[PDB]
Design an enzyme around this catalytic site. Structure first.
Site, short mmCIF file in Angstrom:
data_model
loop_
_atom_site.label_atom_id
_atom_site.label_comp_id
_atom_site.label_asym_id
_atom_site.label_seq_id
_atom_site.Cartn_x
_atom_site.Cartn_y
_atom_site.Cartn_z
N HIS A 1 -5.30 -1.96 -125.80
CA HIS A 1 -5.26 -0.63 -126.44
C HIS A 1 -5.23 -0.82 -127.95
CE1 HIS A 1 -4.63 1.29 -122.56
NE2 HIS A 1 -3.50 0.62 -122.36
N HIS B 1 -1.99 -4.80 -121.75
CA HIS B 1 -1.33 -3.92 -120.77
C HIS B 1 -1.53 -4.56 -119.39
CE1 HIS B 1 -0.73 0.69 -119.67
NE2 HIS B 1 0.18 -0.09 -119.07
N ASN C 1 -4.97 1.62 -117.33
CA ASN C 1 -3.58 1.19 -117.14
C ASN C 1 -3.59 -0.21 -116.53
OD1 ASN C 1 -0.99 0.78 -115.52
ND2 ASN C 1 -0.51 2.70 -116.64
N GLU D 1 4.84 -6.44 -119.29
CA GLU D 1 4.48 -5.30 -118.45
C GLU D 1 3.70 -5.69 -117.21
OE1 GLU D 1 1.60 -3.46 -117.38
OE2 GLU D 1 2.62 -1.53 -116.77
N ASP E 1 4.98 1.41 -110.10
CA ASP E 1 4.23 1.00 -111.26
C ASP E 1 3.15 -0.04 -110.86
OD1 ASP E 1 5.14 1.35 -114.64
OD2 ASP E 1 3.46 0.14 -114.05
N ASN E 2 3.34 -1.33 -111.14
CA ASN E 2 2.32 -2.33 -110.80
C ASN E 2 2.54 -2.93 -109.39
OD1 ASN E 2 1.36 -1.72 -113.34
ND2 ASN E 2 2.05 -3.66 -114.28
N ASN F 1 -1.82 4.00 -111.62
CA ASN F 1 -1.09 3.04 -112.38
C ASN F 1 -1.46 1.64 -111.80
OD1 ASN F 1 0.94 1.38 -113.63
ND2 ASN F 1 2.15 3.23 -114.12
CA LIG Z 1 1.29 -0.32 -115.11
#
Ligand SMILES: [Ca+2]
Ligand SMILES: [Ca+2]
Length: 332
Positions: free
Chosen positions: A111, A92, A145, A38, A246-247, A201
């Site tokens: 998490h 994450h 996140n 991720e 997202d990232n 995010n």
């Molecule tokens: Ca992310």
């Protein structure tokens, strides 16, 4: 009698979008990554860290690739220390920070169950191992996140939701409340630095430390802030896209943002093996100018790579990771 909820949902989740493929030469799936990639970060020396095994008999782990090798092979980094329970490790977003004596710190969002923490590790390069230093949690870090490190235990964190309870947070998201927010954490001081986000995010920072960039997934926006000497953030601009961002990675040489995206929000949020999410990678140049130059560098319907979240470049090569599945290593 307000169909406004339905039409606002359809645009946040981009419900009918279909990917326009953009192809790269020499794409190879990375041997050994099957349970997600991720987030990832590449050091200046070409070592790449990848978090994997995220859950919403294969554990959470951090993987290492040496991108100076011609066929980089992944290896699992061993976690040492007695201050971390590794049986529930569920990594994450990640970030690194390199101090003045050249120590490399790895910060990892974790998490265990439905809570969030940020785990600080020191990278032991010779041994290929991560020494656990500390576990951080905080009431202002409810649903973390990603983070960008600005010191060994100082970071900006996005929280993708305001609520922690999974039932509450899923309703929070569906209603488009946009109560998610960004927190500056340090030993001395912890405070909210921006708020009102629809799913904050990715987050990252310019190489000179002057600018912070924050992805807002479901608004399809990247916010740019001036970062003050006292760690305050002041909004400077907002970029809009037709895709769920997202990232964010930052190319240290140019400052370009490289962005992992989900073209279709339905396929990524409401998963099914018969209709998997595709992938999309954006490059953003000159983010402060009047027109930022935005380029789709890679896009595909997911028959090779499903659910891209992150991408970064090193010496003419592009490394792309995903929330739950594989990773792809391509020539630019
Ligand atoms: Ca992310
Ligand atoms: Ca990150």
């Amino acid at each position: 009698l307000f169909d406004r909820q339905k039409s606002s949902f359809q645009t946040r989740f981009n419900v009918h979008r279909e990917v326009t493929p953009v192809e790269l030469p020499n794409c190879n799936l990375v041997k050994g990554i099957d349970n997600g990639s991720e987030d990832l970060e590449i050091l200046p020396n070409g070592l790449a860290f990848i978090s994997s095994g995220l859950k919403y008999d294969k554990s959470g782990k951090i993987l290492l690739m040496d991108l100076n090798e011609k066929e980089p092979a992944v290896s699992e980094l061993e976690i040492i220390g007695n201050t971390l329970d590794i049986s529930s490790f569920n990594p994450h977003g990640i970030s690194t920070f390199i101090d003045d004596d050249n120590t490399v710190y790895l910060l990892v969002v974790n998490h265990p169950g439905s809570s969030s923490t940020v785990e600080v590790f020191k990278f032991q390069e010779e041994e290929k191992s991560l020494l656990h230093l500390k576990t951080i949690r905080h009431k202002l870090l409810p649903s973390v996140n990603d983070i960008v490190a600005v010191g060994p235990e100082h970071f900006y964190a996005t929280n993708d939701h305001y609520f922690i309870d999974p039932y509450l947070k899923s309703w929070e998201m569906h209603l488009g409340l946009a109560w998610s927010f960004v927190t500056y954490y340090s030993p001395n001081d912890v405070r909210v630095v921006a708020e009102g986000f629809d799913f904050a995010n990715g987050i990252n920072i310019s190489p000179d430390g002057k600018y912070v960039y924050i992805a807002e997934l479901l608004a399809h926006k990247i916010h740019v802030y001036e970062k003050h000497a006292n760690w305050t953030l002041t909004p400077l601009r907002v970029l809009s896209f037709d895709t769920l961002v997202d990232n964010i990675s930052v190319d240290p040489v140019t400052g370009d943002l490289w962005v992992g995206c989900h073209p279709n929000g339905m396929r990524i949020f409401f998963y099914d093996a018969e209709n998997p999410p595709g992938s999309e990678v954006l490059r953003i140049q000159d983010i402060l100018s009047e027109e930022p130059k935005v380029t789709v560098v890679y896009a595909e319907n997911g028959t090779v790579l499903q659910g891209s979240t992150v991408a970064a470049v090193y010496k003419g090569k592009l490394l792309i990771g995903t929330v739950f599945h594989k990773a792809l290593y391509c020539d630019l």
